[PDB]
Symmetry: C3
Subunit: 122 residues, 3 copies
């Protein structure tokens, strides 16, 4: 079981990976939408975590989600942002995000959201 | 033509530079206000883009603009900020900024302001 | 006199120590709560400066303060945080923080806070 994390913040990829390692899943990370788009989506992928504003480009992470959904890829996605206004949250939900989490986040919220994806997958 | 970019975030400098590359302009970066004050403003320079809170010191980017204005240097300046309250935006405008852009930013908004400086 | 600084951001630690160095106090830094909890609190320590969201984990720095308070340790503490809400600020004040400073911060605000700790310690 693989969950792709797309976030341009090095510390975030590090911190998030550590927090979720003791969960039954592999966290494969990407520093940008461009980098992730070169990735052959694995059949073992069950979910995704995406920073809403990749590289400080407002809503670029959500656009990535919208693009993937448009291309038929339907993986439960958790959208996260350390900066967010109401329209961004709404756009995220309309883009089918399973949840939108503001950062700094509460670890149990994230852990719970991921476990749910893990369980719903099996 | 040159546009000075003063932002303490390395990755940010790179991204903004890359984004503005296709435009008829060269971006010269500086990681801090002091680093910039060690600079004799060139005659080929037509504008600036400054992070409002350099090194987490609130409004320091705007104070740089304010001081530059007092020093006679007048270049259309785009002030950008991720963290921002109303007083900061108002200060930037009072400091003569051509625009105040919140980050995360909308790509074409920055591109448009820069092009407007180029055309000017 | 020593003032402990706990902040996961390498750049912040350097910038804050530089800014405060001129004052009559020595700043000793820590990259994490875990690392600080290993430190034997010196008798010369007169205060602390703690990032509220250590390693992106919401309120983890405030949690640290709460733990110190429960251990009978009472050193005037300045909690600092970027991107925070009311509850976080309220939680830090309840944890007995001497002050709560939003970042980006106004330089003299932090300096005056520290100067105050120095004067009240002698």
């Amino acid at each position: 079981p693989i969950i792709y994390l797309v976030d341009h913040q090095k510390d975030a990829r590090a911190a998030l990976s550590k927090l979720l390692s003791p969960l039954d899943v592999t966290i494969q990370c990407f520093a940008s939408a461009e980098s992730f788009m070169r990735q052959q989506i694995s059949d073992d992928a069950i979910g995704m975590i995406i920073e809403a504003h990749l590289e400080d480009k407002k809503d670029s992470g959500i656009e990535l989600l919208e693009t993937l959904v448009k291309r038929g890829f339907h993986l439960p996605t958790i959208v996260m942002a350390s900066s967010s206004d109401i329209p961004t949250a709404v756009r995220a939900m309309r883009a089918s995000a399973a949840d939108f989490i503001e950062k700094p986040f509460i670890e149990h919220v994230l852990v719970h959201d991921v476990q749910q994806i893990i369980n719903g997958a099996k």
